[PDB]
Ligand binder design. Structure first.
Ligand SMILES: OC[C@H](O)[C@@H](O)CO
Ligand SMILES: OC[C@H](O)[C@@H](O)CO
Ligand SMILES: OC[C@H](O)[C@@H](O)CO
Ligand SMILES: OC[C@H](O)[C@@H](O)CO
Ligand code: NA
Ligand code: NA
Ligand code: NA
Ligand code: NA
Ligand code: NA
Ligand code: NA
Ligand code: NA
Lengths: 759, 759
């Protein structure tokens, strides 16, 4: 209850508030940020140090892209917060430092998740795993992977095998957790450790009194581990010559301190998505102070942000080839939520909001960080226009509905994890669940649980539907029951996973940057929505004839007549989609979950649209066997043939109320369809999004939107002349990737997607 | 469900019953053992191979004794079931093989429990711990010790430091677990693995249905671990040239198979007590069959037993000096329950009951295994006398009330864990809890929670008792309060401990030899019962005057008048002892425990009588500060002066109904007090015990009795000339030790105890 010298000095000039007496980053931002409604004219360009540093790093990126393999990686060191010595690109040039290992782009071994994935990676890239590391993580330290497979059921293994429930977090970090790295800059490590000690002590009474004994013992051990992690963060920063016991005193230290918090996380956990948070405006408070005090020039501000962002562009994890198939493009999801509006009506847009976007110019286009615009119909027009402009120039940004999420949480400090999943920073997390195959689930309804490809009994043994024609009501009723079964197997698989993940790979350094009690949801994803929705339309508005095999197994279908397709704004096919989202949600919503994580859903697939597509046979909608599904909630490839306003209206109808974990939409529009010149395009793009995201009592609106502005012909050229587009970047499923980083097959999926020609 | 050729050949000649269709070792024993009512005249002597082996082993034992340190031990190998290669004393002479490490008496490193204790052991015995092993168990694989101290409260640490709650299992294996090692001989490993697989599968419904979600997941993973441990048991055996996939076909294999099951235990866990169980009668079934078929002679049968028992005399664990103070004499508690009566009235004594006892003749006196006689007033007099005789010749046996425990359990297949804690084999286990200092809890009541030696607040802040003379009613009221507090701190400490042991050192190889669901009790011990009872008695029947220091702390007590002391069959004081046992039991009874283990109480101390005595100041009964308490439930050193029958009567009055974990009594009587000649002594000892254990609806009777038949003069001679008594063995608290293995301080305790001079 006394602010020492350290805090008063570091906070000189800052406006007072609860934030000075307790951990409350939101309050600090609310009382100190400077809303900015000006334009981009103040922006500086890169320095020589930035260009030199980035150009050198790109040599490693080019090497990664052409070999589709890591530049290098550890084979004899288990990665922890303090295991590696300091590594640099060029120590003399960097303003913000810190690498995962001792060298740029060298990937680490994070064994706590499973030694098998690591062995598989070593084999896939002709490297050899150290015998001791292998022995330790096989016989001495049990891993998340072995724990999950020691408890899985034979049914879950069958679903995994058949492609109905594949790619779940049983062989890679679950991620979906965002520690509030801003806390390190604002309070310094010692303060945070003191606060965790109080949290630990607060559990003593319940522990002694027998109140929820096991949950209390678990949380106390977790807090103890978090506290130990904070201490390791200091040792880690000291390796770089920094003392972070106290709070950041200037802009450089605020950025350096925040990043150090993130660095500890990417050094200790290999979560699928390791998001950064909502930091640009927070950091602007420190930059703004140094500028007014004349301690830094604007160009120096840009350089600091560029060096920070550059490090985020360098985060790497050793993954398996199977991982590569489910999550393509060497993704990191170092997501940053930019802008938004506060609850008080002010815009949370700052000059730093602009400096972050400006990295796409200072260092060229880049898939990471995953810059996400918190869009509001009330953002400054200067910012709305500049964002569209960056989109048109780079196809590197995504947009999410702040007018929808902010009121939903009734909070102006939530951030986006991975692609489209929101969480109040430092107070919420998700138990990541990948996604289930809804399309194949429909086929199981028609084939009595037998897999159309493996002729295996996977779903519960039922009577396959008989007849030369498929009746909507019959197929559907069956689909309903099979959805019940999918729900049960999915929830059970996740209960096991997260029980084991908490036990064998608890994200201590990230959780140390959260409140004592963290809200947890169990995010369940569904793949192939448009395939199943279209499949139900072709059945309900046309004539579908099952082409059965000698065992009476429907291995194909012939369609008589046209049927309405999702993405054209046709209520007939769009209502089936909306309903399907609602149907699965209510189902998982009844089931018991681990640690009482509240079930939620997301229409998101990442590269599963391809994986599940390959493992699913011909479907009622006319889609061929082994054909990629549409990304996330996207209408099937090329089916949304009525222009932009048409497809956006169809997707914008999907209910966020039954998919709180998010709804992904990858929208690609050719330049001329947006306008004759850039001023027209900027204005039209911003106008489209205003309408897509439009929100009111009677209109929920769209949740997310990836925006690619390009001509299909450019990619084809890129495919043949990769060395010509080293930094070409594109939105593919709720995140971006460098086109040259995808495989031939993954590019084939992209080049065959819809390229909106009209408005 | 079909007995292949293996089971058929192996079980040739055995009577059928449920045991052939399910795991049920008790049924196999009931339907096949041969009761014996004859005498010891059939016993053979030791073969030269036996004598040659034992003599070489005694050479290491002498080294251990004179150095009070390990003959040798690992510094770089983490022990598991399969880690070490086969080890022998002399491969050509051993009939039963198997050692913990690759050499006789060499101790292993069992790191899962904690690295600090191993470092401490290395330091104390001048060996250097391998850096790699230290790193792994400090940074990659969290240990039990780490887990506990991460969750402990400052209150528990203060009790640990002050001597009110010290020596709990937070720095050594909990033990108190007896796997049914007989199951390996009877069914073979493969059949057990198949059974465990069914147990695993039987939990799938609940998992899928969300019933006791976290408990079910926990059990499935544990069964997965048990199953895996069973396969390693096979690999371990195979290194010795044995295939234990199938059941034992003869006596040698039945003994070897059973010992192999135990060997997996003592290679993977370092529990304080690693008891053997109730196996002699079980093994008689195989020995008998081989004798009757002429496959082996009686001397050959004795040899196999001797080589098995020899191996039990060689179990060793690397302990710290701190551990050595709490559990003196290099104890193992490889406890074997011999004899008893079946529920059908037949005696369970067999020729093997006699063979086991005979090892004390064939290989001389020995403290391990801890041979425990399950006594009944209805045992065959022939056996009763032979056991009494063996006690007179060796002082190596203990007796426990079969007439009291068999009825309480309604089961004739329960075994003794450690000293006096009973459990139905393969269906029950205890959560070991060591003991609390009841005497200090009384001083705290008088001193307002302030510790009399450390002069610091430990118990709840409270007003010290005022007055020049103490009043029984007041002191007992304050005491009742501090006992409420001790109960809460104690169970809280144990809840944390067992939650952590389950998490970081689950005894898989042992639990693999138990049923799917195991009954668990949370055992709390009390130390200083007689010190506390006498203190109260003195306060109530005499005039106790507190002598206080300037701060009002009662540092001494002067007494006016004589008062009844426990152990003289004087209801005035014995009732106070009975009252304390009842009070504490009703208090812990109301507390929530981890995994719902039923609280139980034991009046047992092991060497905590010496350790707590050193940390406890002058007490109201007259005991001086630093003086040892009485072992277990014993009267204080020398206070029982009215003969054996009286002291036995006092102890038997202690309520087993309120102390289900056991009540230990160490009875020492000079040869002549027992009788003029050998035959008379035997007959009289047997008489005293029938009286002591006498049980009926209104007379519970004693539960346990250590029997030493010796003269104090002999132990004195031994103190000056240890080399003259290399195998001298004495009972000291519910187990035995080689007198030479004790420290001088520990011997002082033993020599100043009561030596009963009359009946
Ligand atoms: O290690 C490289 C990854 O396998 C590839 O997906 C990068 O594009
Ligand atoms: O070797 C058995 C171990 O307990 C394994 O299951 C985890 O390391
Ligand atoms: O390691 C041997 C022990 O230190 C000793 O107490 C045995 O008597
Ligand atoms: O160093 C942090 C680890 O989690 C340690 O606490 C257990 O090995
Ligand atoms: Na370049
Ligand atoms: Na770590
Ligand atoms: Na728990
Ligand atoms: Na919507
Ligand atoms: Na273990
Ligand atoms: Na008698
Ligand atoms: Na009794």
């Amino acid at each position: 209850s006394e602010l020492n010298e350290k805090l008063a000095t570091a906070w000189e000039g800052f406006t007072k508030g609860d934030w000075q007496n307790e951990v409350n980053v939101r309050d600090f931002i609310q009382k100190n940020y400077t809303p900015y409604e000006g334009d981009e004219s103040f922006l500086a360009g890169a320095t020589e140090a930035t260009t030199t540093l980035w150009d050198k790093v790109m040599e490693g990126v080019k090497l990664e892209n052409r070999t589709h393999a890591p530049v290098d990686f550890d084979t004899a060191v288990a990665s922890t917060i303090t295991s590696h010595d300091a590594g640099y690109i060029n120590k003399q040039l960097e303003k913000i430092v810190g690498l995962q290992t001792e060298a740029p782009l060298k990937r680490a071994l994070i064994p706590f998740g499973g030694i098998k994935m690591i062995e598989g990676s070593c084999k896939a890239y002709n490297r050899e795993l150290d015998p001791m590391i292998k022995k330790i993580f096989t016989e001495y330290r049990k891993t998340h992977n072995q724990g999950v497979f020691d408890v899985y059921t034979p049914d879950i293994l069958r679903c995994r095998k058949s492609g109905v429930l594949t790619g779940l977090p049983d062989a890679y970090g679950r991620g979906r957790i965002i520690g509030d790295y801003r806390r390190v800059a604002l309070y310094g490590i010692d303060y945070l450790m003191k606060d965790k000690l109080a949290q630990f002590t607060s559990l003593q009474a319940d522990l002694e009194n027998g109140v929820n004994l096991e949950q209390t013992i678990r949380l106390r051990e977790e807090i103890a581990e978090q506290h130990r992690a904070l201490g390791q963060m200091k040792e880690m920063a000291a390796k770089y010559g920094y003392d972070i016991s106290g709070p950041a005193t200037n802009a450089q230290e605020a950025i350096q301190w925040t990043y150090f918090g993130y660095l500890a996380a990417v050094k200790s956990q290999n979560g699928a998505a390791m998001s950064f948070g909502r930091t640009s405006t927070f950091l602007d408070v420190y930059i703004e102070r140094d500028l007014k005090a004349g301690k830094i020039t604007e160009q120096e501000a840009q350089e600091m942000v560029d060096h920070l962002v550059m490090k985020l562009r360098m985060v790497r994890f050793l993954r398996t080839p199977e991982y590569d198939e489910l999550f393509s493009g060497d993704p990191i999801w170092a997501t940053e939520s930019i802008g938004g509006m506060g609850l008080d009506g002010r815009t949370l847009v700052t000059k730093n909001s602009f400096r972050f976007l400006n990295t796409l110019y200072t260092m060229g286009p880049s898939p990471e960080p995953n810059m996400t615009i918190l869009w509001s119909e009330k953002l400054p027009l200067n910012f709305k226009k500049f964002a569209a402009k960056v989109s048109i120039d780079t196809s590197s940004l995504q947009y999410e509905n702040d007018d929808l999420m902010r009121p939903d949480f009734n909070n102006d400090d939530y951030a986006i994890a991975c692609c489209v999943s929101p969480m109040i920073v430092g107070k919420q997390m998700q138990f990541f669940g990948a996604r289930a195959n809804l399309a194949k689930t429909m086929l199981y309804a028609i084939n009595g649980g037998v897999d159309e490809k493996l002729k295996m009994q996977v779903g519960p043994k039922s009577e396959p539907i008989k007849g030369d024609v498929l009746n909507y009501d019959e197929v559907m009723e069956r689909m309903d029951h099979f959805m019940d079964w999918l729900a049960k197997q999915y929830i059970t698989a996740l209960n096991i996973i997260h029980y084991m993940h908490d036990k064998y790979s608890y994200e201590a350094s990230l959780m140390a940057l959260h409140d004592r009690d963290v809200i947890r949801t169990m995010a369940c994803g569904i793949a192939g929505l448009s395939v199943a929705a279209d499949s139900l339309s072709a059945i309900k508005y046309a004539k579908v004839k099952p082409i059965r095999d000698e065992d009476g197994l429907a291995i194909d279908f012939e369609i008589e007549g046209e049927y309405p397709q999702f993405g054209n704004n046709d209520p007939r096919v769009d209502d089936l989609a909306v309903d399907l989202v609602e149907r699965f949600m209510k189902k998982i919503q009844k089931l018991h979950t681990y640690r009482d994580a509240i079930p939620t859903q997301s229409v998101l697939t990442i590269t599963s649209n391809v994986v599940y597509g390959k493992k699913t046979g011909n479907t009622p909608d006319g889609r061929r066997a082994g054909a990629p599904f549409g990304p996330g909630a996207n209408p099937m490839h090329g089916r949304d043939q009525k222009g932009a306003v048409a497809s956006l209206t169809s997707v914008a109808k999907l209910p966020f109320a039954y998919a709180k974990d998010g709804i992904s939409y990858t929208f690609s529009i050719v330049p001329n369809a947006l306008g004759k010149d850039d001023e027209v395009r900027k204005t039209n793009l911003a106008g489209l999004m205003d309408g897509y995201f439009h929100h009111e009592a009677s209109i929920e609106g769209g949740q997310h939107l990836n925006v690619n502005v390009m001509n299909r012909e450019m990619l084809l050229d890129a495919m043949e002349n990769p060395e010509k587009y080293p930094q070409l970047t594109i939105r593919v499923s709720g995140y971006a990737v460098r086109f040259n980083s995808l495989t031939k097959e993954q590019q084939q999926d992209v080049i065959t997607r819809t390229f909106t020609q009209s408005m």
